[PDB]
Each structure stands twice: as structure tokens, then as C-alpha cells.
Design a binder for this molecule. Structure first.
Ligand code: FES
Ligand SMILES: [Mg+2]
Ligand SMILES: [Mg+2]
Ligand SMILES: [Mg+2]
Ligand SMILES: [Zn+2]
Lengths: 82, 175, 161, 84, 157, 197, 37
RNA sequence: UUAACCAUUGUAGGCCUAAAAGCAGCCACCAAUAAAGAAAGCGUUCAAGCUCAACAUAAAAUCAAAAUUCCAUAAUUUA
RNA sequence: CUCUUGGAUCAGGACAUCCCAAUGGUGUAGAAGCUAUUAAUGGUUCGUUUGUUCAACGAUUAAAGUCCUACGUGAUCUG
């Protein structure tokens, strides 16, 4: 029942280290490497909502993959009432 | 036979939920919890750990365990107390983009099979859904002073929430 | 209860009833009008490009019938093949036929019957491919082509050495 | 059913029922269902019609050729023979 | 025609089958009946046509093998029953498994029997002049057949 | 190759604030005879119930409709409206009734839903009405009218009810009512004939 | 064998037959579901 | 619009609810994979378990013609 | 605001069956029961009024069925 409350107090440490990363009691908390030391694509992740069917290209898997989910959504909607 | 549980290392004996059913299949129930407890000593504890215990006609104990749940792991990273009931407008933890990258550098390595989860987008989007599933709003970046301003609002908001529950609880007791 | 109609009025209704005209020939038994050409949705064209790239890029293509292995047991084979950097490819049979009709490989159509899977790589690690096959005895191999040469299972085993 | 033996030749265009029947025989639920059976698959390159052989420890041997028998008949005969 | 032979070892041998007479009078007809211009000109009495779609034990063949369209399949199926009930197919009787023998009762002559004789109730109370209960004769499915009479056929007797 | 296609979208639908059906108060012969002149077309929603007979709806009928629809409908995605007046005609006063004519829409539903979802419940409610009715939609309702026009144009009968009645051939008007000239034989008492042309 | 005006299938296993001049819905798993017209 | 075959996972999504895990709710509802809804149903004290939809593989193609004792006889095709 | 029925004798008939008979389902272990389908075969008792607006009580029975037939039936009898 002892869910851990909010932890840490230092914004700089939170942005330059992370205490919660460590998963071994013996293991120490890891520290963050330089920004340039990580790949560019890591920082280029999509931080917004997923692209909608209108935005996605009709010739892309993502456009059709969402369309497949929507069709399943429609089937469940119809199947619910029977 | 694969059996999956999220029991926490801190508490090793649920009891009737697990021991009898496994005993009905046929297992060393006393060994099972103690075997879980000695594993708890070896590694961290107090956190819900998924397990993949295998039960066969041979009746062989094969516990499989590893790194803990993502939500609790993210809660420490974002300083999240816990989930809130509403989860619609509830905001607890806001964390930096860089912090998200570093936390998951080794967390995704806990995959039971060596899943080629090279895109971290798969994990952050799952955490976005997880946080929203919890009483959490995940913003791109939060300022510490902004957190303090909200925390003052949250304390007032939480106090009003308790009063609303108390009024309903008192009314229910009268009924 | 419907109030009865004077017999004279009843006679009027019987004579003025609707009569439909009937065609000389029933449409179904007639030859069908030509169907409008179907439009290729953005699945075959995108899928078409993928199959062209995998056949051209990968020198060796091994065709094996799908044995419907369990997901838990399916993962290890992918991981074993992933350790060998060998990929598994599956495509709908319908879209596979047109390329095999007009391509460098055209005699593999009899093999391409039923459920099938394709083993594709960029290196001729055939011994590892056969070794990963030995993990599952029941699963057979139908053969295919290695290094742009068409051969069956019996030849592949000797080719591994 | 103590043992089950299936053989066929892929590249020759001939009976396909056997290959589908092999798939049904080589099914994880089926192999568990008749656990006693040993599943064996051996592909051949000669000009030989596919032959299915079922072997019993009691000495009864059931040989089945897909040459003109459909997959349905394969299972139907197999089921009745297992009963005996 | 494929026959399965059991010699235990069993095998099936394919044999030759006679082919349809060449030169259909009306090519481009999708169903075999249309090809020969027989749409509305066959009845239960036409055993020669009907027998061609019958198994050696009197059963109907599946549509996929025959290739008939839905409308003609239902008509042929219904006409076969009446031909059986009218004693017009003596060599297509049911198979007696081990010791069963024909019931050996007297045979009542019939024709144009819509329903199974077993499960029809008697008409104990017939009606008065224009409230009479009718006794069905023939099948509704064959209504549209060509008629050589001044007025349409009387289905209810 | 299962062929997937774009799914229909309800991005044009807007849900009213008051989704549920409001309560009808218990308290405030040619009326049911002949064709309906009111509420004959779709107003707001895409689905409704269409009467095929003339009948009186008392208060008890209203509650049966209200409770059934309110119990099933989802306020978030569904809405319903009343398309008929409340009971106003006094019957000896013991109770009040709302007259209904053939072709009148009784209740109309809408929202982000398709007809197939609501067919079963609407048909069930229709069966319980005191007059014969069937659930219809915008497309189905238009098709019936289109079918009626087709039947008149292609009819092969040289003789029709309208010509004979208006021209008094046979002196047929001796045996007819004034209304026959208007209705043209499509209405008899309170009953509507669906195939009379 | 409840005799009802409309016979309706009540479970997946229910099936329909035409015996002795009437329509039946028969379910082996649940004999409760047996009906006649 | 269908009859054939199937089912891996982030994690048991938060929430006084012990727990309420796709399924009491309650808001969110995202994730990987070719292909899988924080689930259209059952079912579990909660869990388990059964299904649906997905994976490849197939095929077909609206309303209508009761009380004395049965009561003409019969009949489907000739212009 | 109001204002023809009983009984005796002899019974003809319907099935919407009370008992006897053949069956399906069950929250049917056996024994008892509750419900539904089919069928008109013969049967279906004896005494009594302190209170009870077209009621009740005693003793029994395998059962003490519901109805139609100008109160079935007074040129057969009777209150
Ligand atoms: S007879 Fe030709 S399709 Fe019907
Ligand atoms: Mg009598
Ligand atoms: Mg009865
Ligand atoms: Mg007298
Ligand atoms: Zn059932």
C-alpha cells in the first residue's frame, strides 16, 4: 500500500540525472551523457497526437493501419446491439 | 503452463488467491512464496514485478522475473504520487523529453524475448496512454515553478475532493 | 374488422389492379455485361513495390510451407534467424502470382501453391538456414533459389557443404 | 496411432490434398490430441506420387495415397481406423 | 468417375466418363437448362432429363458439380421427389443396410404429390360452398410453366 | 485479400444538449381517416418510426415509448425528439388521445449512429403501437416514394380507378362516396392499401 | 417442447429442422431451448 | 453482405473500489509487431478461463398465392 | 333512488381433461412435486346449517372436472 509519493526536488538534477532509473540496490543511479552523444532521431520523435486519417497519405501503411482499426471499431459498434 | 502475476516483492504471501489454485494443479506452495521471498532479497523489492512461472506435469518450478512495471518506474522519474480516479483532467507528473529517453535506455531491455524495439516512440506513446490511463497528464516540458503553482492548486483541489467525499460518505452513513 | 364493400364496388377494384410488364428474357440466364475494371487500392501498389525490392535485393529465396507454429515457438525462430540477420517474408497468394508470371523466376509457380513462407537474406548462410530448419523436424522445405539458381531441398543440403 | 508417416514431392504439380493434410497432421493441437503419434516429414524430389503411411505397434499399418483421395477421406479413414 | 477400392490398403482409381453431346442449340446460356431451351417445358414425367442429376441411390447432386442456377436447382429437386413418389424411378431405391427388407405393404398409386405422404392429416371437417377447404395438387414452384389450357391450372382440388 | 474501404464518419453530426425525451402530461370522426398532411418528412434526425394506419395514442403509449428509448439511448452519442402533439382530444372526460394519420412520423432519432444499430429497438417499439407501423430512414423512406412513382408509370392496366370515378363510367358514382374521388381508392376506412395504384 | 407462435434460436448451438410437418428448434446442449411451432 | 480458420504484448490501464486486470464502475483509451479493440460478448470473489473482430486461405449472391351427423359428385392442359 | 329457478327420473353431445393411459423440460439424486404436448375410453360418493351477500362444515375417494342441450326433461312427478 506504500506507493511512493512524488520524489526528488532538484530540476537540474531531474534534467541531468535520474534516480529512479536504477533497478539494482547494489547498482548506482545512472547519470546523463551529453546531448550530442545521442542520435538525432531520438530527439526527433513525434511529440504530438498521432497523425489522423486525413493527414496520412493514402499510400502509406499508417493510413491503412488506422483504417483497419476503424473498421474493427465499426464492427464492434454494430456487433454490440445485435 | 505459463502463469502470469504482478505480485509485489515486498509482500510474498497473497495466499488463497494463488496457493490453493497452484496447489490444485500441484505445487510446493510454501516453497513458492519462500522461493519468491529469497529472490526478493537478491534484487530490489516493494514494486509489482511480472512473473512467468512455468507449471508442467513434471511439477518443476521455473520462475522468470525481471525489471518492474513501467508506470511505477515512470512515477519515480516524473515525481508522480499515484493515479487519480478521474484521469480526464488529472495531472500529476510532467517530465522532460531527454529524461524520457534516458529512463528507457535500459528499461526496454527487460523484454522476455529480445524484441527489436529500436523505436522509442513505441514506448513513449504507450507511456502517454498509460499516464492518461492513470491520473496523469504528460506535457512536453514543465517548469519547476509551474509545478509549485499547480501543487498549490492541487492541494486545494484535493482538499475540496476530500470534502466532497466526506459529505457523500456522511450522507450514505445516515441512509 | 373491415366494412364489406358493395359487390359493384368490389368488381371495380378487381379490374383496376396493378399489372407489371414482364421481360422476354430473364437477366440472369443472359450473358453478363462486362464488369467495370477494378481500381487498384493503395495496398497492392505499395505491396507490389515491397515484393519487387525483396526479390531483387535478396540473392537467395527459400520457399517453405507455413506450418502454423505457436507464437511462443514462433518468436525463437525469428530470434534465431535474427541472430543470423535472416528475415521471414509472407504475402497474399493473389498478389504473388502476377510477378511470378512475368519475372526472372517463372518455374516456381507449382511450388507457390497453398500457404507458404519465404526466407530472405543478403548472405548465403544456407547451413544456418538448414540448421534452423533442423530445430523443427516436422516443418518441410520446398526448395527455392539460392544465388539466383533454382534448386530443391536435396540440392540445398549438399550446397551447404 | 503410434506413428504417422507422410511423404510428398513438391515441385511436381500433383495432388495438393496431401500437403494440406500434412498441414492438418502437422498441427500443434492435433499433435497434442493424438500425442502417441510421432510426426515425421520427409520431402522427396523423385517422380513419386505422395504416400501417407500410418504405423501401429500392434502391427497394423495403414498406407494412404493422395493420388486421387481427397483430404477429407484421409481423415475419415484415419478416424475410423484409430477407433479400432 | 473415381471409385475407392479397399485391398488394409486402400486406393482410388479415376475412370472415364461420357461427355455432353456437342453443339448446344443455344450457346451463351449460363445454366445447362437454358443452353438447351428447356426453361419452362419439363415436368415430373420427364425421367430422361431428371435421371441425369440423380445419384445411384436417388439423392440429388450438389449445385457446384451440376452447375445449375438456384431457380432450376429447386425445380429439379422438387420434380425428383414427385417422380420417386409416383414410382417412376424403380432402380434408384434406398439401400438396405444389413437385414432390412421392404415393408411389403401394398402400393397406392399417386401422381403430383406435393407433400410427404406420412405427415398429412385427414380433412375431418370439410367446408361449405365457398368456405371449402382445398386439397393441394402439384407444386407452386412450377407455376410459370407453359400452359396449353384456356385458364391457368387448378392447384387446389 | 479482404478489401478494406474507408469507414463512414459522423464529423458532421452535432448532439443536442437535451438528449433524452421529455415527459408527456396525462391531461392537458374523420381525424384518423385518410392521408397525413403533417410531419411527413425527416426534420432533424435520420431515423424515425412511420405509421401505416390511423389510430389514437393515449398517455400509456407515450410512456412505453419514452422509457424504452431513454433506457437504451446513450446521451453522449444519441438523441431523440417527439414528432407528435400531446393528447388533447377529450374522450368521455376519462382520457385524452392524439389522432394519427397514415404517413406520420411519430418519433425521430439521430446522432453518430447507423440505421442497422437502431433497427431492432425501433421495430420492437413499433410492434407495441396501437396501429401498424415500421421503422424507416431517410434512404428507405425515399425509396418507397420512388417505387410508387415507378409503379404508376409502368403499369400495363389500361383501366384505373381514377379515370372511371371521375368520368362516371357505368354510373359508378351511384355506389361511391365523395371521398373516393380524392383518395382515388388508396384509402378505405382507416386502412391504407400499399399496392393500389 | 414449448409450443409457441414464433420459434427463435436461443444459443449458438441451436439448430432448426422440419419433422412431421412442423418446424422445430432443437439444442442438444440446453434441452430447455427445445421448441415446436 | 457469408460458411473455412485463429489468436503474442507494453500491463492487472487509474480510481475510496481487498481487487476489481478488455470486461462493476470510472475517465483515458494509446503499444509493439504483416495481425490484435486498453475489447463486440460469455465467465470468473478479483484472477482465470471461452468467445468476436484481426493473420494468411476461400466460396456462394423486400413482401406477397364447441356442443344430434363430415357434407353435391369429381377434376391440374385439345387451340 | 329503484327492479324465474331447485329436486326426482332418464339422459344425448362438446373438449377448453378431474381420475385412469402414452410422452418432453426442470432450480428432476430417490420419494414427493411444479409446467407443457397428445387422447373423450368409462367413471366421477354419503350426510349436515351456529356465524359467512350466490358461503360454509363432517366423513371419505383412484377422482369427487368445466360446459351446451327453450330450469335438456312439469300431456312423466314434485318444492
Ligand atoms: S437457366 Fe440459365 S442461369 Fe438460370
Ligand atoms: Mg351421457
Ligand atoms: Mg387437448
Ligand atoms: Mg314436456
Ligand atoms: Zn440452445
Amino acid at each position: 500500500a506504500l506507493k511512493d509519493p512524488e520524489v526528488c526536488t532538484d530540476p537540474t538534477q531531474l534534467t541531468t540525472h535520474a534516480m529512479g532509473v536504477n533497478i539494482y540496490k547494489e547498482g548506482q543511479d545512472v547519470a546523463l551523457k551529453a546531448d550530442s552523444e545521442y542520435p538525432t532521431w531520438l530527439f526527433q520523435v513525434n511529440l504530438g497526437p498521432p497523425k489522423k486519417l486525413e493527414e496520412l497519405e493514402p499510400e502509406s501503411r499508417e493510413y491503412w493501419r488506422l483504417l483497419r482499426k476503424q473498421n474493427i471499431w465499426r464492427h464492434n459498434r454494430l456487433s454490440k446491439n445485435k | 503452463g505459463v502463469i502470469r502475476s504482478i505480485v509485489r516483492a515486498g509482500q510474498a504471501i497473497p495466499g488463497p488467491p494463488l496457493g490453493p489454485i497452484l496447489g490444485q494443479r500441484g505445487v510446493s506452495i510454501n516453497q513458492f512464496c519462500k522461493e519468491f521471498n529469497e529472490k526478493t532479497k537478491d534484487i530490489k523489492e516493494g514494486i509489482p514485478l511480472p512473473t512467468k512461472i512455468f507449471i508442467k506435469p513434471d511439477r518443476t518450478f521455473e520462475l522468470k522475473i525481471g525489471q518492474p512495471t513501467v508506470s511505477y518506474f515512470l512515477k519515480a522519474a516524473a515525481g508522480i504520487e499515484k493515479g487519480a480516479r478521474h484521469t480526464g483532467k488529472e495531472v500529476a507528473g510532467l517530465v522532460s523529453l531527454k529524461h524520457v529517453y534516458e529512463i528507457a535506455c535500459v528499461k526496454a531491455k527487460d523484454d522476455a524475448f529480445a524484441m527489436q524495439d529500436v523505436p522509442l516512440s513505441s514506448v513513449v506513446r504507450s507511456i502517454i496512454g498509460s499516464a492518461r490511463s492513470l491520473g496523469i497528464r504528460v506535457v512536453k516540458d514543465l517548469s519547476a515553478e509551474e509545478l509549485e503553482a499547480f501543487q498549490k492548486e492541487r492541494a486545494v483541489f484535493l482538499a475540496a475532493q476530500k470534502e466532497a467525499d466526506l459529505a457523500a460518505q456522511a450522507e450514505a452513513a445516515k441512509k | 374488422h373491415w366494412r364489406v364493400m358493395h359487390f359493384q364496388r368490389q368488381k371495380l377494384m378487381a379490374i383496376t389492379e396493378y399489372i407489371p410488364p414482364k421481360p422476354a428474357i430473364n437477366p440472369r440466364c443472359l450473358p453478363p455485361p462486362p464488369k467495370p475494371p477494378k481500381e487498384e487500392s493503395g495496398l497492392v501498389r505499395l505491396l507490389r513495390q515491397d515484393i519487387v525490392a525483396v526479390f531483387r535485393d535478396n540473392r537467395m529465396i527459400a520457399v517453405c510451407q507455413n506450418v502454423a507454429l505457436s507464437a511462443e515457438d514462433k518468436l525463437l525462430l525469428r530470434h534465431q534467424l535474427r541472430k543470423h540477420k535472416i528475415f521471414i517474408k509472407v504475402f497474399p497468394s493473389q498478389v504473388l502470382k502476377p510477378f511470378l508470371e512475368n519475372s526472372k523466376y517463372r518455374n516456381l509457380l507449382p511450388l507457390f501453391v497453398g500457404h507458404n513462407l519465404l526466407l530472405v537474406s543478403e548472405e548465403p548462410k544456407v547451413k544456418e538456414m538448414v540448421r534452423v530448419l533442423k530445430s523443427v523436424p516436422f516443418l518441410p522445405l520446398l526448395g527455392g533459389c539460392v544465388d539466383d539458381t533454382i534448386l530443391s531441398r536435396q540440392g540445398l543440403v549438399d550446397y551447404a557443404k | 496411432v503410434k506413428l504417422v508417416r507422410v511423404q510428398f514431392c513438391p515441385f511436381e504439380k500433383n495432388v495438393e490434398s496431401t500437403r494440406t493434410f500434412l498441414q492438418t497432421v502437422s498441427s500443434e493441437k492435433v499433435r497434442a490430441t493424438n500425442l502417441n503419434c510421432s510426426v515425421i516429414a520427409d520431402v522427396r524430389h523423385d517422380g513419386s506420387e505422395p504416400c501417407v503411411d500410418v504405423l501401429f505397434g500392434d502391427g497394423y499399418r495403414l498406407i494412404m495415397r493422395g493420388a486421387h483421395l481427397t483430404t477429407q477421406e484421409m481423415l475419415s479413414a484415419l478416424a475410423s481406423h484409430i477407433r479400432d | 468417375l473415381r471409385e475407392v477400392v479397399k485391398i488394409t490398403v486402400i486406393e482410388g482409381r479415376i475412370t472415364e466418363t461420357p461427355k455432353a453431346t456437342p453443339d448446344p442449340p443455344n450457346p451463351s446460356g449460363q445454366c445447362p437448362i437454358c443452353r438447351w431451351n428447356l426453361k419452362h417445358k419439363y415436368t415430373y414425367e420427364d425421367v430422361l432429363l431428371l435421371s441425369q442429376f440423380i445419384r445411384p441411390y436417388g439423392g440429388m447432386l450438389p449445385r457446384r458439380v451440376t452447375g445449375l442456377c438456384r431457380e432450376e436447382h429447386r425445380k429439379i429437386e422438387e420434380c425428383v421427389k414427385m417422380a420417386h413418389r409416383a414410382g417412376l424411378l424403380p432402380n434408384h431405391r434406398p439401400q438396405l443396410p444389413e437385414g432390412c427388407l421392404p415393408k411389403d405393404k401394398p402400393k397406392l398409386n399417386r401422381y403430383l404429390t406435393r407433400w410427404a405422404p406420412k405427415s398429412v392429416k385427414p380433412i375431418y371437417k370439410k367446408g361449405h360452398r365457398w368456405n371449402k377447404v382445398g386439397m393441394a395438387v402439384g407444386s407452386p414452384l412450377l407455376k410459370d410453366n407453359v400452359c396449353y389450357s384456356r385458364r391457368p391450372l387448378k392447384m387446389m382440388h | 485479400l479482404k478489401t478494406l474501404l474507408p469507414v463512414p464518419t459522423f464529423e458532421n453530426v452535432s448532439i443536442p444538449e437535451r438528449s433524452k425525451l421529455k415527459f408527456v402530461e396525462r391531461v392537458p370522426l374523420k381525424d384518423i381517416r385518410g392521408p397525413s398532411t403533417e410531419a411527413t418528412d425527416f426534420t432533424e434526425g435520420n431515423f424515425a418510426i412511420l405509421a401505416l394506419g390511423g389510430g389514437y395514442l393515449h398517455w400509456g403509449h407515450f410512456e412505453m415509448m419514452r422509457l424504452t428509448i431513454n433506457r437504451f439511448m446513450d446521451p453522449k452519442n444519441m438523441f431523440a425528439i417527439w414528432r407528435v402533439p400531446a393528447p388533447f382530444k377529450p374522450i368521455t372526460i376519462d382520457h385524452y388521445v392524439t389522432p394519427v394519420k397514415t404517413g406520420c412520423l411519430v418519433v425521430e432519432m439521430g446522432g453518430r449512429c447507423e440505421f442497422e444499430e437502431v433497427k431492432g429497438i425501433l421495430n420492437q417499439v413499433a410492434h407495441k403501437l396501437p396501429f401498424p407501423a415500421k421503422a424507416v430512414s431517410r434512404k428507405t423512406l425515399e425509396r418507397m416514394h420512388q417505387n410508387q412513382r415507378e409503379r404508376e408509370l409502368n403499369n400495363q392496366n389500361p383501366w384505373t380507378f381514377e379515370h372511371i370515378a371521375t368520368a362516371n363510367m357505368f354510373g359508378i358514382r351511384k355506389f361511391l362516396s365523395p371521398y373516393d374521388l380524392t383518395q382515388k381508392g388508396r384509402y378505405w376506412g382507416k386502412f391504407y392499401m400499399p399496392k393500389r395504384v | 417442447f414449448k409450443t409457441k407462435g414464433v420459434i427463435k434460436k436461443r444459443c449458438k448451438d441451436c439448430y432448426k429442422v422440419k419433422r412431421r410437418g412442423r418446424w422445430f428448434i432443437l439444442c442438444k446442449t440446453n434441452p430447455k431451448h427445445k421448441q415446436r411451432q
